[PDB]
Subunit: 45 residues, 5 copies
Amino acid sequence: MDLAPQMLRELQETNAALQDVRELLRQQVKEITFLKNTVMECDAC
Amino acid sequence: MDLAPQMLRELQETNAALQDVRELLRQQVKEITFLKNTVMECDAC
Amino acid sequence: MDLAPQMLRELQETNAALQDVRELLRQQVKEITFLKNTVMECDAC
Amino acid sequence: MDLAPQMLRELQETNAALQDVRELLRQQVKEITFLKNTVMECDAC
Amino acid sequence: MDLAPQMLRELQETNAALQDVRELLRQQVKEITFLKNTVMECDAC
Ligand SMILES: CCCCCCCC/C=C/CCCCCCCC(=O)O
């Protein structure tokens, strides 16, 4: 049959999944940065 | 037709993986938020 | 009903996301780095 | 067929690349989980 | 308008970028491990 339609469904799914990754990574950095600033004021240090 | 069958395979294979990367990062941020909470409550600071 | 233009769009939408995923990973690496250093000069260690 | 064979070559590469990222990532979570437990199981806190 | 040439340029860019992400990742793993080890040999805990 014609697989173009199928090939397009995969990319859209890819871009979808890729969007969650950008958000998760987006949030992860803020935590890491927050982690750095917290460990930056940690007294024992 | 063409290499659609082949090219389609790579894509499905690319998603399967990304789907996994997503979940990995997904859980990772959970392990990074706990770590963040732990340092915050760490009396050593 | 040629899906080329549409397909071509998802691609451009993927790279845009990657471009952003990449930039985020650069800053994250730079942040973690700074955090590894801080932990090293940590007295109580 | 045209640039098809060459596009398939890129897809196969992107796919091999994801694998690597996937793996490197599956390792980060261990390094991070572990790290999490240790920080948690710290007496100085 | 034959869009094959352009999609080929996109795929290639998808691999160029992925190589960055893959390259930036493995370095970060190194830092995360370096971080870990430091914590482990940290007295206070
Ligand atoms: C032909 C379709 C294009 C291929 C789709 C795949 C897109 C590339 C995906 C990149 C994965 C990036 C993952 C980065 C996660 C890093 C997480 C971390 O370091 O904490």
